[PDB]
């Protein structure tokens, strides 16, 4: 009707590696929209 | 006198949150300056007719 | 996180806010804002005393609402030439005014403040401590020609 375009998938913005995880060089630790 | 519609009408339609009726009241539970009052033993909606 | 004991450690918007009628109770007479005007023919002296009173208020912890300048009033001196029947230009006097707007003051502190200002008043300066009213606010604005003509044709 009047409300259009409200359909958009989530960008999966979150924390990938938690505290204690052994990571390697280049591993993305966390993605975010604003500086969290 | 209480107005039926506020001076600025809400143009955006809001969902009917029934949580504002569900549960105990947290505000206006004690006396301010009077000595008697009308206490509500349940939940509901008050409109201009009431 | 919400359930962690370190919740709200970055909470900062409550430390800064970035988004006056007279309060007379008889004992704590903290009236409204006050306008202190310093008027002088010497622009340098007017600015000097404006800076001085501003720094004095800042040291005395008096909340200064504003520190502005009013439009200059330029008067023309027309002297009567000798033998009468003439008016010739002598000079022109440019009168400046600097206004400091403070917020709060008590009776005792206001008395002490007026004491200090009138004791440190330089030569050739008019000091006027008044209340900030609607006419004092509208004085530093423009002509309402259309608006006054509209009121005239309405009345």
């Amino acid at each position: 009707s009047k409300n259009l375009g409200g359909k958009s998938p989530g960008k999966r913005f979150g924390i990938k590696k938690m505290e204690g995880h052994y990571v390697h060089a280049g591993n993305i630790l966390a993605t975010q929209r604003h500086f969290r | 006198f209480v107005e039926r519609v506020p001076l600025v009408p809400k143009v955006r339609r809001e969902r009917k949150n029934l949580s504002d009726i569900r549960g105990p009241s947290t505000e206006a539970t004690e006396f301010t300056e009077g000595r008697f009052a009308i206490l509500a033993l349940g939940g509901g909606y008050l409109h201009w007719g009431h | 996180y919400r359930s962690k004991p370190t919740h709200g450690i970055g909470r900062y918007k409550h430390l800064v806010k970035a988004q006056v009628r007279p309060i007379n109770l008889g004992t704590d007479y903290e009236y409204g804002v006050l306008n202190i005007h310093l008027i002088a023919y010497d622009m340098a002296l007017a600015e000097s005393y404006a800076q001085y009173v501003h720094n004095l208020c800042n040291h005395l912890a008096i909340k200064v609402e504003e520190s502005y300048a009013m439009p200059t009033k330029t008067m023309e001196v027309l002297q009567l030439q000798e033998q009468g029947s003439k008016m010739f230009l002598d000079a022109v006097l440019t009168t400046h005014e600097r206004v400091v707007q403070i917020s709060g003051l008590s009776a005792t502190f206001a008395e002490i403040f007026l004491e200090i200002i009138h004791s440190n008043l330089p030569e050739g300066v008019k000091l006027s401590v008044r209340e900030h009213t609607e006419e004092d606010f509208k004085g530093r604005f423009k002509a309402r020609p259309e608006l006054e003509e509209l009121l005239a044709k309405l009345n």
Partner: protein, 140 residues
């Protein structure tokens, strides 16, 4: 009769919704008359002895201004503590007088004040004659 009043009130409201910008101050703006004399002003060639005496005078002036500020603030503190002692004595003596004195008088709104002069006024002095006129600009 009525449509004219409607248009009148409409124009009134439209003019009221406008801005209320202030008068530009002729002191903070430099006139165009000061653009032709900047090339004709010769330098000063300040000498070393004058520079040194000026620096010494500036240091002495800083010290003197500091001392003046200190003594003025000491006098202010003395006056303030005397005022607090007087108010506490009044509060101890009688509360009614303290309550009626802790307010502001209705005669303090139009506080006018004038500073001293270079010479005292001369008795039986007469300004010869002359009229005044205001040549200040207008703005809309």
């Amino acid at each position: 009769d009525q449509a004219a009043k409607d248009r009148l009130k409409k124009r009134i409201r439209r003019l009221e919704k406008a801005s209320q910008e202030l008068i530009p101050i002729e002191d903070f703006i430099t006139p165009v008359k000061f653009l032709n004399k900047e090339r004709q002003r010769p330098p000063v060639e300040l000498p070393f002895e004058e520079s040194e005496r000026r620096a010494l005078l500036l240091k002495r002036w800083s010290l003197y201004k500091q001392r003046e500020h200190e003594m003025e603030r000491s006098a202010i503190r003395s006056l303030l503590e005397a005022q607090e002692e007087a108010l506490q004595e009044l509060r101890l003596s009688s509360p009614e007088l303290h309550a009626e004195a802790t307010k502001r008088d209705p005669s303090l709104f139009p506080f006018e004040r004038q500073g001293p002069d270079y010479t005292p006024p001369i008795s039986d002095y007469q300004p010869p004659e002359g009229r005044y006129q205001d040549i200040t600009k207008v703005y809309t």
